[PDB]
Amino acid sequence: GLPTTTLPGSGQFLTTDDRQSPSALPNYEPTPRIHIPGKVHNLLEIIQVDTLIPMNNTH
Amino acid sequence: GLPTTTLPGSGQFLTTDDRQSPSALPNYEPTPRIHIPGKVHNLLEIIQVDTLIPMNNTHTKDEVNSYLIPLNANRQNEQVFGTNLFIGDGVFKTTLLGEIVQYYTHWSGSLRFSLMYTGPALSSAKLILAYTPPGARGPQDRREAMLGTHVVWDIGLQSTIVMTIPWTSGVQFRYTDPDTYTSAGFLSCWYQTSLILPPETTGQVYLLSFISACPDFKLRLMKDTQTISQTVALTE
Amino acid sequence: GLPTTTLPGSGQFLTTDDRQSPSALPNYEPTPRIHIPGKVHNLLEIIQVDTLIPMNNTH
Amino acid sequence: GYSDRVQQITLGNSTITTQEAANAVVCYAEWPEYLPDVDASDVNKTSKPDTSVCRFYTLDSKTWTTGSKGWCWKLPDALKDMGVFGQNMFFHSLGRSGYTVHVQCNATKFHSGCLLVVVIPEHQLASHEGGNVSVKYTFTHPGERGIDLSSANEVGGPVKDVLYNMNGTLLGNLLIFPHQFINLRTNNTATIVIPYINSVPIDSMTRHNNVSLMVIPIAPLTVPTGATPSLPITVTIAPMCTEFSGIRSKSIVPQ
Amino acid sequence: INYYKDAASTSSAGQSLSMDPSKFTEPVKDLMLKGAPALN
Amino acid sequence: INYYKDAASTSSAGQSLSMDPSKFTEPVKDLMLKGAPALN
Amino acid sequence: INYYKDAASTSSAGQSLSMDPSKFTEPVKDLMLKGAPALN
Amino acid sequence: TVASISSGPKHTQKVPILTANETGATMPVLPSDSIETRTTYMHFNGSETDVECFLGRAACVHVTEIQNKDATGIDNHREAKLFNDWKINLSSLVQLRKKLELFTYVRFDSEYTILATASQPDSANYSSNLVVQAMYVPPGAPNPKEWDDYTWQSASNPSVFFKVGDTSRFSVPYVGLASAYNCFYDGYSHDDAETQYGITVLNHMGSMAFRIVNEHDEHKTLVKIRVYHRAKHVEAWIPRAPRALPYTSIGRTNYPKNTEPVIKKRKGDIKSY
Amino acid sequence: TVASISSGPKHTQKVPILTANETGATMPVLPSDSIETRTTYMHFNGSETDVECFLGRAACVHVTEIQNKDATGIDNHREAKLFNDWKINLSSLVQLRKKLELFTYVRFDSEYTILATASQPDSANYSSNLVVQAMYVPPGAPNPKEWDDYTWQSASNPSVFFKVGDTSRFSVPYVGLASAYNCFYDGYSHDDAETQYGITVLNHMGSMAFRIVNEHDEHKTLVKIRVYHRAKHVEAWIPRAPRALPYTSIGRTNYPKNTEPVIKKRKGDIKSY
Amino acid sequence: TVASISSGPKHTQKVPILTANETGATMPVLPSDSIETRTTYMHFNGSETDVECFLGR
Ligand SMILES: Cc1cc(CCCCCOc2ccc(C3=NCCO3)cc2)on1
Numbered sequence A, C: 001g002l003p004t005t006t007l008p009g010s011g012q013f014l015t016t017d018d019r020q021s022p023s024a025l026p027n028y029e030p031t032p033r034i035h036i037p038g039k040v041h042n043l044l045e046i047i048q049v050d051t052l053i054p055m056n057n058t059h
Numbered sequence B: 001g002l003p004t005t006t007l008p009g010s011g012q013f014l015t016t017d018d019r020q021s022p023s024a025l026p027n028y029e030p031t032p033r034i035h036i037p038g039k040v041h042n043l044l045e046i047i048q049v050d051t052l053i054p055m056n057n058t059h060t061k062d063e064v065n066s067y068l069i070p071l072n073a074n075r076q077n078e079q080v081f082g083t084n085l086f087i088g089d090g091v092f093k094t095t096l097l098g099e100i101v102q103y104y105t106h107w108s109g110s111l112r113f114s115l116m117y118t119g120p121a122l123s124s125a126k127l128i129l130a131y132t133p134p135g136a137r138g139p140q141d142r143r144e145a146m147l148g149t150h151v152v153w154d155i156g157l158q159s160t161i162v163m164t165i166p167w168t169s170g171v172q173f174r175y176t177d178p179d180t181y182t183s184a185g186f187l188s189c190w191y192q193t194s195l196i197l198p199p200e201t202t203g204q205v206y207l208l209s210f211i212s213a214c215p216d217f218k219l220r221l222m223k224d225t226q227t228i229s230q231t232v233a234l235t236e
Numbered sequence D: 001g002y003s004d005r006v007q008q009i010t011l012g013n014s015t016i017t018t019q020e021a022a023n024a025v026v027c028y029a030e031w032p033e034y035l036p037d038v039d040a041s042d043v044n045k046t047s048k049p050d051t052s053v054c055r056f057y058t059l060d061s062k063t064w065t066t067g068s069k070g071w072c073w074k075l076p077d078a079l080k081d082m083g084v085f086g087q088n089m090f091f092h093s094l095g096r097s098g099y100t101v102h103v104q105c106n107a108t109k110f111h112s113g114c115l116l117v118v119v120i121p122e123h124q125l126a127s128h129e130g131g132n133v134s135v136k137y138t139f140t141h142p143g144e145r146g147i148d149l150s151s152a153n154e155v156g157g158p159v160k161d162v163l164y165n166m167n168g169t170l171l172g173n174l175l176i177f178p179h180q181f182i183n184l185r186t187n188n189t190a191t192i193v194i195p196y197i198n199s200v201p202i203d204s205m206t207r208h209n210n211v212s213l214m215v216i217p218i219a220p221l222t223v224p225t226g227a228t229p230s231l232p233i234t235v236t237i238a239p240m241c242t243e244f245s246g247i248r249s250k251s252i253v254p255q
Numbered sequence E, F, G: 001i002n003y004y005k006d007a008a009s010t011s012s013a014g015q016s017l018s019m020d021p022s023k024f025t026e027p028v029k030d031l032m033l034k035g036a037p038a039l040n
Numbered sequence H, I: 001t002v003a004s005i006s007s008g009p010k011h012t013q014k015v016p017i018l019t020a021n022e023t024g025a026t027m028p029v030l031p032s033d034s035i036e037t038r039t040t041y042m043h044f045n046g047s048e049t050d051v052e053c054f055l056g057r058a059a060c061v062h063v064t065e066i067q068n069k070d071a072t073g074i075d076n077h078r079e080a081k082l083f084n085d086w087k088i089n090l091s092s093l094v095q096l097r098k099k100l101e102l103f104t105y106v107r108f109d110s111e112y113t114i115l116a117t118a119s120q121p122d123s124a125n126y127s128s129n130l131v132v133q134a135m136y137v138p139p140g141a142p143n144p145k146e147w148d149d150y151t152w153q154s155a156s157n158p159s160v161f162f163k164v165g166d167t168s169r170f171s172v173p174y175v176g177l178a179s180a181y182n183c184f185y186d187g188y189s190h191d192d193a194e195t196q197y198g199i200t201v202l203n204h205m206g207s208m209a210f211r212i213v214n215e216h217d218e219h220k221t222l223v224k225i226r227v228y229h230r231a232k233h234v235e236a237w238i239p240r241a242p243r244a245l246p247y248t249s250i251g252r253t254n255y256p257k258n259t260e261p262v263i264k265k266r267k268g269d270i271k272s273y
Numbered sequence J: 001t002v003a004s005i006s007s008g009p010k011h012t013q014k015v016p017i018l019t020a021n022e023t024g025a026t027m028p029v030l031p032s033d034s035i036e037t038r039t040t041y042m043h044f045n046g047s048e049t050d051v052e053c054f055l056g057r
């Protein structure tokens, strides 16, 4: 038995933390990926495509 | 004392997790293993053995007779049997294949459907078996049936014919519990010419039919079977 | 602070488990061992010595 | 000119010839062999009567008729009275054996009918009473007579319902067990070689049967017109690699 | 890392990755080749 | 250190650091050079 | 790994794997050979 | 990395700012093509706009509720919330939904966190300590009928037991049947004349079922379950226009009638600032 | 790995699709023996169908119950559920049972999880905190008679103490007397004319006994014990036909009389789709 | 480790089964001194009978 101390924050759930978890479906094999045109990696990729501005807002 | 933090999920019991535990019987020595023929390693090993399909489901109480598909002498053009291919339900459901498929949520792969003929040796017959891939209705006459996957079977010395339902699918997995989007087709069988009995012989002859999975087959995402339930715990 | 998760069984006391514990008497020095004839290591050593059977149980 | 079709099995002082076989099955792809030391527990040297016990015993014949439901024999029970095999059986504390089973049924090219011949390791039967009624000893030790699945329920006996294999499983799935069909149109015999299958290296031959052989008509017998409506079925079985151990006084068993 | 001394206390075993259906699908004494006649 | 056997159980992935807007911003068949006339 | 300083605090000991019944089963002064007569 | 290079006066025949938008391209014009700039560096990587980051935080996807009470004489446990279920889906709560539907196909593993808290709205001597048993019931599995059916044995179906007030957490691999989940599907399950249209046909992933393991105490206890979902290992294809109108249904694109103008009207002219 | 190879038209004397099923073999026929195929790969290993995986998740194997109450004047603790036991066995609850009986002999280590929750069905000021002490009582050990006997000293018998609401977990090596556990046994314990038939004779593994360590408070507290069992290090021999009819007893194969047809009757002809 | 060695018929002047218990010894006689045995291995170490194990729970 190794001695430990727990710190403030133990047991909290922070929606933004990133840790490991047990898989509920041990050993399951996902469907293979096939190729699909159009993959997005960054939202910065798409905000460089121009779109129309409803400038004439007066309606 | 090393500082720690516990995460969400601490103390939970997940029936599917796999960790170490203390042994209650420290130092105990199990009985030696001896050799026993028959070891199974994968359920995929056993679903390749074929078993009989109660195709003739039309009875009213379970009987040996629902395994027998009858054949009539001298009929021409007509249809011997029909079934959809929901392997998790209907005729398939009690077969070993059907029975295992039901422990999993998704299946993919080819099926092997064979028919063994049992009529007198001096008789003869030519049958057509047809697989209709998803998208069309169960065929209504041989003309319709013969335009899809089919095998003309010539009854001979070689007693069985093995038809394969090759995996025809957009989506790479189907549901074992019957689902539309995911549906697999129909299987029908018709006289190609007709059964002919020798003299001094009479009546119906029967075909036995089996189902097993090709080596192609995949099953995934285990779950509980609708095939067994209970209302109170059993006792001795 | 290192992230941990506790499993089912935490806090249980199993009379058969074998782990480390803090010594209540830090630094104490036990009496030296001297030699004593007769040490037993296995119960298998002693069940090979024969003893009498009350076979005539009829009293 | 060898065919899968003709075969000869010579075992001891007895030989079988079939001119219309359909290959032969060897359970789980293993052939009977003696008990290796590495697997041994009892310290006794065993007795291997060899050719006096490893020969072919032909049990009494059955009659397949249009109403037959199927028959069931248990091993080593069925042989409990055959020659020196049987004596050895009652006289040693433990014994072990594999078998060659040869089921015979010939007809003509006008008959139809198809039997399933299957070997089930550890076939624990069910009581027809339900609940937790047991199946008495005598009932599961029919001897050479075997059990006739078309006989009536008896008290303390097993259930004899064929669509359920005498245990709550469906006839259709018996095909997962080593088996072979006899289809009058193809076949006239079935042969299965059974290796010794148990969770212990050697066991008692009287309190535990380790396989049931089952012959079940599946496509009903259909004879040519004005033929006699029945065929006999004969079962011949030969112990192979038999070993007996722990000799003594000679067991006395119920009934 | 096993934290415990006994083998029973270790986690689940790891995939056989054995797989050989022939003891169940082809227990015939004389070998059958696909394509050759079943009964000669 | 992964403590678990399955890949789904690992933490979040790490930045694509891929980034190539041209499939979205310039899907034209004949290449356009900035500075050269749009329509020739 | 011992986490503690004192020896008493370590876990159970490990199997003697010593085993010698002769101090108990054959404490005779003149050695007896099995097969030779007990009393000469 | 430079964010802007240094550039000076220009008097050319080479005009990068005149283009033809009819072509469908967005020409990569920069400040330095039309004013004189000075060098500046980016100092930034675009880390927090990665799709893994964008879809990778836990979002509340479902709130349900079950109660612990005497089931004696209840003819319909499901109906008494003696246990309840949830027809798994990720489109019911609409904050996370707008984020996912920025893409057409999406592929990811899920990490679920389940928080359970108890309420005792009417007179109790105390707060009891209940254990919840949420279990996954996939399509074609014996749906449970009472709060203590054989179903709950869950011998082949993953189930987690945790305490009310605590949280349970586990992660499920990408269970889609295809290569990606369809965020949209302009199809049917077959060519019938009246079959539903959308994804609901596609994305039918079975349901999740919760219950309290405890028998009943003298008072009644309300337990409210909140399921959170975090995408990990994200892959997204084909960006689409963001959702403008409100949502009405799980799985259809339908918007409400007599909705309100979504573009803010100017208070003034086109010319107004 | 290829799932299908490419294969084209055939006009041969070599027919792989004609066989003789009477032989007992299932000939390994493939799609490419009878249609023209294209290459495709498996992309799959068959991981989740390994028997270790199939039998390796926890299943509920037993639910019992004990209560904490004043034993004053109780003539039969066992009978008041002052403590209770369990005649260990794995065949009492039938979800896990059908799974195991797909095999004839099975060998594995067991991992037990025991969840205990408390109920206070009638008026209590509070919820007390009870410690359970489940202890293993093997065959030929002083069975306990009162809830506080010398037996509970358990000086040589493994016992675990945990709190109600919590879970206890430990793992026991394969304790079978033979090389495997018999899932079936067509024998008797000896050749008597009336001795029981089955496995119950074979699989008699002694019982497990639970009690609360706490003395009594003023109210009564019901504690319900659920035992979960997970097989680890699995080895299975000789596959058998799956169970079709319902079960009636621990350890016998017996099915109920006037049971219902287990094969679904067609709504239509043999010819129906 | 062998639990029993193989041993066959004996007709000797060397009798390991006759002893004098008055001496206080327990002579180490085995099955193979008086019946015909076959080889078998122990498959066991005597781990759980160690005194550390016996007094260690
Ligand atoms: C699009 C889209 C994506 C998703 C999410 C799919 C998640 C797969 C199935 O989800 C679960 C949920 C819960 C459990 C569970 N097992 C034990 C307890 O909860 C398992 C899988 O839903 N729609």
Ligand SMILES: Cc1cc(CCCCCOc2ccc(C3=NCCO3)cc2)on1
Residues within 6 Å of the ligand: B024, I088, I089, I090, I091, I110, I112, I134, I135, I136, I158, I159, I160, I172, I175, I181, I182, I203, I205, I208
């Ligand atoms: C077939 C078959 C297989 C099994 C399971 C056998 C398990 C061995 C004995 O089980 C236990 C159970 C509990 C404990 C225990 N020790 C301290 C607390 O619980 C020890 C062994 O039962 N039938």
